[PDB]
C-alpha cells in the first residue's frame, strides 16, 4: 500500500 | 511580412458575399509551470522543496 | 502618478524601486485598534510591473487589481486575489498582451 | 527509501 500524498494547504506570495 | 497595413486584404476563397463573418487577431494564450519538483510543507502552509 | 485604488477592505498603490514597480496593499491590521500597514503584494514577483505605474485599477465583482505600466506599454498586469475569513487564499500575478 | 528533510520554516535573530 503506497504512501498517500500529505494534504498541503500550501499557500501563495514570497516564501 | 511588411504588415498588415501594406497588405490589408483577407482573401477568402469563394463568393461570401452577404454573409456575416466574424474577424480577430488571435489571443497567445501561454503558461509555463514550475518545475515538477517534490513539495513538502512543515506543521505550518509554508511549502519546501 | 497612480492614485491609490481601494478593493474591498484594501487600498493599493505602487512604490517604485530603480528598475522595477513594487505594488503594496494598504489595509488595517487586525489586532490594534489604529495601527495601519503596507504589505508587499509582489514580493514574489519583484522584477515583474517596470517602472512608470500610472494606472492602477480592477473590479471588485471579479477579485483583481491590474496595473497599466509604461514601462511596458503593451502588458495589463493582473493581480487575481481571494479573501476567506480574513486570508489570502489567492495571489496571482500575470500580465495580458494584445500585441 | 531514505528519510526526507525536515520541513523547518525555522526563523532569525537570536536563538
Not at chain 2, 11 to 29: C, D, H, K, P, T
Not at chain 3, 28 to 47: F, L, M, R
Not at chain 3, 81 to 92: K, T
Amino acid at each position: 500500500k503506497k504512501s498517500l500524498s500529505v494534504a498541503r494547504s500550501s499557500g501563495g506570495g514570497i516564501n | 511580412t511588411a504588415g498588415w497595413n501594406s497588405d490589408p486584404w483577407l482573401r477568402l476563397s469563394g463568393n461570401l458575399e452577404g454573409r456575416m463573418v466574424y474577424i480577430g487577431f488571435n489571443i497567445n494564450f501561454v503558461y509555463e509551470f514550475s518545475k515538477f519538483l517534490i513539495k513538502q510543507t512543515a506543521d505550518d502552509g509554508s511549502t519546501s522543496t | 502618478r497612480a492614485r491609490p485604488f481601494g478593493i474591498g477592505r484594501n487600498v493599493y498603490f505602487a512604490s517604485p524601486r530603480s528598475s522595477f514597480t513594487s505594488i503594496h496593499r494598504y489595509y488595517a491590521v487586525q489586532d490594534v485598534s489604529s495601527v495601519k500597514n503596507a504589505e508587499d503584494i509582489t514580493s514574489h514577483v519583484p522584477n515583474y510591473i517596470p517602472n512608470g505605474v500610472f494606472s492602477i485599477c480592477g473590479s471588485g465583482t471579479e477579485n483583481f487589481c491590474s496595473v497599466l505600466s509604461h514601462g511596458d506599454p503593451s502588458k495589463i498586469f493582473m493581480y487575481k486575489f481571494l479573501y476567506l475569513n480574513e486570508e489570502l487564499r489567492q495571489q496571482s500575478w500575470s500580465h495580458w498582451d494584445f500585441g
